[PDB]
């Protein structure tokens, strides 16, 4: 039979294992919506293309698989640009399918046409391309999927002109290729692997740090077997934290940020094995505050430019992170036993403890709910059956202090782009993936950031996605207000106050359950109750603004744990 | 004294006459917020960068002046991309100021950095540039303003690296240039002008069509004097419609779409004077449906590629539209004796009438409020003291039928990009400009499109902007649903229903006045009352979905006014 | 009948008035070569795409019309990039037609395909676009031509996929549009024009400076009538110099660089009317060395960002330069009352004189032929019947000192890009245009720069283009060597010597007439003889390296006329 170009798209996605799409309808892509309808492939349709974009990101990250976003020509594409950029930075594998104007109508000042969408996306994608012929669709879709999924993972843009999608062709005349692309990543040269293990055995206080590429491959069995065998404690940036959840307690270092205080306590690591973590925002750049200059660093990353980017390293390996973990588990399952490391792991715990307890002791909820105390209420409920997504500024910095000591099913935080607002879309897509794994999704966001995508409460009710949305409400763009006060002056605060709005009332108006709470008592009760029902909820938590999370000070070169501190201004 | 780079920005803006900015705070652009604070330049801060972007568009269009938008690095910029694209298409003069990462921190995988923001904006701006030195700021800002304001007007992107803004400089060591750029546009060669007037005198049924460039220059006095002298009826696309408001009734043709039916009534124009209207979506492309092939066309546009783009023309002039209008008023005040044209203007009116009355007769509100009847309620209140902004799909197509016969102060509709959602931001900025002119702003949007920027109700309350928001609510993405039914089949509707949500309840939760109405009685009453108070309001109007506006059919090559019609698909 | 897409291209070009193309063949564009063959439209085929590119630039500038370049997919396009960039900077109207891979074969790692040619050209063109359908060809070609010819003039790239050109369609089913685009540019608002004239009358020592846009419009009659009426002296950057050739001697200021010394002699202009000249390399940037800070400046340019770019100005007008000249001629033929200015014009001449005579007196050919003396030999032959093209570094700086006082038919020099090597292609295309106007073309280039395109001697012989090529040979990349020795040190010279090669012997080997000369006697004789025959020639002129032209020192902030 004759079939549309939109039909060729969907047949090809199906063959690649895609089971959900995220998008927002337009006539230019209707052929694709119609094919999905015929094939029972759900499309999670949102109220903003950005939210669809971020949802496909969230589905990808929470599910360790390909996310797919689908947007129409013109405004559709331009509204998807923030998700694309965020995926590029975060190394998230998303295929963005966009419509564009018909090639037949090129340069007619017509509806939604006239944007060079590929030129716009080229600098924020692994690959961006416009399809010139209907027969090409299946190979170019499959090619795009291979680009997205190979290491380092990333976003890909495929532009599908309206006429190219509406054109019909004989199904007997075009092949739909399979997805033939090894799931097992490339391993290191054995010589390099041996050299790494030689260094690791010789080392006195070694640590491992995991990045995004370790979550994408999700090689949990190999990882736990490798750590079980060597005894080495493991830390991670935010993307890598859920990979620590299946490790024996005594070797979970938690978030890499805890390494801060080690130098001051004469316990700086002398070896660091970086598995797909990068020198950048989460690892203290080239400063040495987390990853010491004096330490022998072994870095594994699929992108050779990332190796020793900001610091000298002892050994640099271009390989897949997953394949590397696998190879380490192999090499390690057969050789002599490894040195003890029990004393070193006890140290790591003890320091994570001191940090936590120092914050606990400093935090009061006497006059208003302290953000730390609010974050602790959430942690009580974080097991393997929960995915936590984090947005906001101060909100997530506070939340980060409770996360090292619990074992989340998933944990999705900001990446280098720090784009406020992305959390809602992200969490929605995470929740889609999580229903399939029987997990529950919780978004912890700030009163500012929730504003960006607050329409998606509609989408939760319509699609019966039981996401819980917790709003740490400090009546402000909090982090930026703090900058204004600290970096400029007491009364130079301007454009950062949000002294208005009933966010639970908004959610109620869209049909979600709305709670407003202001204390530890009331918040625990409300969260328990929302977790008990399989319904979407919004909990508006009134929270203090003044308190300064330690990571605020650290990310501008000040010691939050000393007595005094110089302001670099 | 020493002053920041952000300070140089603001001093330069001030000197160009800018009195408001639209934006959303980030640390990377705080220097600019601080300078505005010192100089009492208000920044209208929104809940989404897109809304700020569109608000500067709206301020520009409603005010016939430069709009300025201000966004931070990374996500700030990516969230502004849809406004930039829309400005490019609509020929709207907006200066977009964006932060970016410090040049000192280039390539350190740091916070919000690493997006080639200029590369992304190059293909949708008149000019995009990244400032390399603090001393350059004033000349490059002024240069950007000149680029934006010269014909054809358009958006400009100026990227200001964080370190460049924070750097301090002796004020005595850098000059702030004036804005030296003639406000009077260039005129046509007199030979060409004479040839145009020769043709216009010779012609039997001439018309004038105005585009966006005629609103930007706003030469209302010259225009009315030229029309007074020649007797020629004047039509306009959406951007040009407010320029007809000061003309004698007998010569207001209204929206250019009314030309549709003229051919069928043996009254096709034999001359068309296109002043900055373009061959494209609003003028029936190259089809000849509105601007006949047989007619002698005289086209004036500042962009030479636009001339006879899709059709042959008799005479093509590259000049400013405003200067051309001025020149015509001159030439025409001299000779001053022109043929009658009363019969022809009566015809034009009569046909506009027939159209209107045919729709009136076809429209029933017996079982649910018909969108035409809803649009008529709004028209009762459209005088020179109102700016109407329009968003949605079906919603604005219906509204277009009542607009020709009233005289709005401003009227801001979609352009070629047809980007749903832009109206809220647009209207907000329009309202800022309109307080200065004592005008009231009304947004007419669809239940889908309001979702995109629904957070900006917060902004209305915080900033006490008394915008009225009317939501034509048909429980759906209406236009796309119609496509699905018409172009594909009865029960191929999918991803276009929005059978949920209390939008007035949302507005109430943000502190705006909320009304829900479902009849002509109740809606008139609610609008009167919201117009009487100087407060922001949201009126949720329940409205029928089935009715098909004539422009739906016309924009896909079908006759809504015949009896039968062939489906092109 | 059925016709190819290449045929639609050529029919459309014809209708726009195009009479020559410059290019180099490939299978991807053969359809266009075949159509040109049928319609007797010559294609000047070169040995390098760059030379074709520059030749279309040269044809455009010398002829004041559209130049058209034609290159194949892949390497064809990448080789044309330098011409495109140069046209963008110099505001030269060129349409670049490039092939690319078939849309049917997109992403098959096939022959010459896989370069995003539009992305590459976007940042150096007025417009760059890839044609998606054969029916679109005539409107998009014509649209591109309108883009190129409207102010400010510039290059346009139109990418034509192989399958799109080979496709056939019914000729009756697509319209070839006319070129409907006013030749008369837009004029200033009269209020602005009156304000300008008010200023010009009030001024005590006014001058006019012409840029490229004045050559493109070539409104010589209006210009001469405006100057005749106001008495104001006129200067120009290199592109504008040929527009001074038809003015009365007493009002020719010559090259704008002569304004240097006026401040020192207490005679700095107090008003400057900039017609399409820009603040930049040729006008002393924002320094005030040429266009004084104390002067009231009136700037006219079609590009509003150019107005007061580097300096404050009194009045800024966005309009076509040609239309503005026309409008000034009109306003000025009415009122008819203007102040004398004879004393001021005498001053201008007298300062141009002092400069020239100071160089003359300083220049010796005792031990080897001095470049100034070589430039003087050339000037003897520069009348309205000659186009001079200039390449090289030191070579053109020296040559510039003899050009103000002669009246060339055309004069084509470097622009802001200063791209060495472009002169050969440029001059070749200039010569094509000039045969039609009965003018002779002379290229004055350096021994370095001639190397870039030396294959085009083949093209001269094959196409019987009687271009004369003069090589100022100082055995070196001269200007850069000077930098090395003066900015860094006596014996830090490295990578700048070219102590090898018989360039006249090369030309002989390609069939051109070759001369080698080393004195004033021998050079005059050789140039006379080459100008007497209607044959292509190469004169290799041995010339001194040490002498420092004044503009070398000026372009790095030093006074060559002090102490
Ligand atoms: C898209 C975007 N806009 C603005 C910023 C700048 N920014 C950094 S933190 C912050 C405040 C967010 O406030 P909120 O979400 O309420 O959480 P809180 O700071 O109070 O924890 C802002 C605006 C950004 N990073 N991204
Ligand atoms: C940003 C964007 N997304 C999607 C579309 C496709 N589209 C065109 S009309 C329309 C429906 C708008 O519905 P609504 O705003 O409720 O107005 P209605 O047609 O129902 O009156 C859509 C989604 C678009 N043009 N732009
Ligand atoms: C394409 C290019 N490459 C290099 C340069 C740098 N450059 C400036 S002047 C010059 C020397 C030119 O030598 P020549 O043509 O012999 O003239 P001369 O200065 O010796 O008279 C060079 C190489 C340039 N401007 N363009
Ligand atoms: Mg907050
Ligand atoms: Mg709707
Ligand atoms: Mg040399």
UniProtKB/TrEMBL annotation, chain C:
Q: Which positions bear Phosphoserine?
A: 27
Name assigned to this protein = Benzaldehyde lyase
Where is the Thiamine pyrophosphate enzyme N-terminal TPP-binding domain positioned along the sequence? 4-120
Domain Thiamine pyrophosphate enzyme central spans what residues? 193-328
Q: Tell me the Gene Ontology biological-process terms attached to this UniProt entry.
A: isoleucine biosynthetic process; L-valine biosynthetic process
What top-level branch of life does the organism fall under? Answer: Bacteria
> What family does this chain come from, according to its entry?
Belongs to the TPP enzyme family.
- Taxon lineage: Bacteria, Pseudomonadati, Pseudomonadota, Gammaproteobacteria, Pseudomonadales
Instruction: List positions binding thiamine diphosphate 1.
Output: 25, 49, 394, 420, 447-449, 474, 478
